[PDB]
Amino acid sequence: MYTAEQKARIKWACRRGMLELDVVIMPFFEECFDSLTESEQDDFVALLESDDPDLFAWVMGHGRCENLGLAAMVDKIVAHNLSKVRLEHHHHHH
Template identity: 55%
Template sequence: MFTAKRLARLKWACRRGMLELDVLFLPFVEQAFDELSDGEKMTFERLLTCDDPDLFAWFMGHQKCHDPDLASMVQRVLSRVKV
């Protein structure tokens, strides 16, 4: 279960060192995070523990994420924030 404190930590973790990642993560958490199942929320939380260079490569399509759960979450975030 995501308490208010845990959600606040998650939002803080969305603030990355790269603007390209910030503009993906923050809107996703604010607009779509509540729609995720508990398992998906945990996967998103795990995604945020990955290194910025890996995240950047996955989200920009330069590399493929080999973890199927994380790769699915990358696609979910991308599909949600793309106009």
């Protein structure tokens, strides 16, 4: 299940012009990988070759994602972020 080779593809893809996305993927994958199955990971890696405009809006709480396969892993990401927000809040907006 999965390869370090595949992980390298992720490393190149998370690198956007905004650090917020890269920082919630690079070390988060280390943790979330334990909770992510190949089926989830496939759809995740499929996304990584593009950007996440609508998905970014899910993080801001105003997005649209019809394929809940994508939204599923986003929800799993958000759940981890929520504890940061409740702890010492966040920096981006509010």
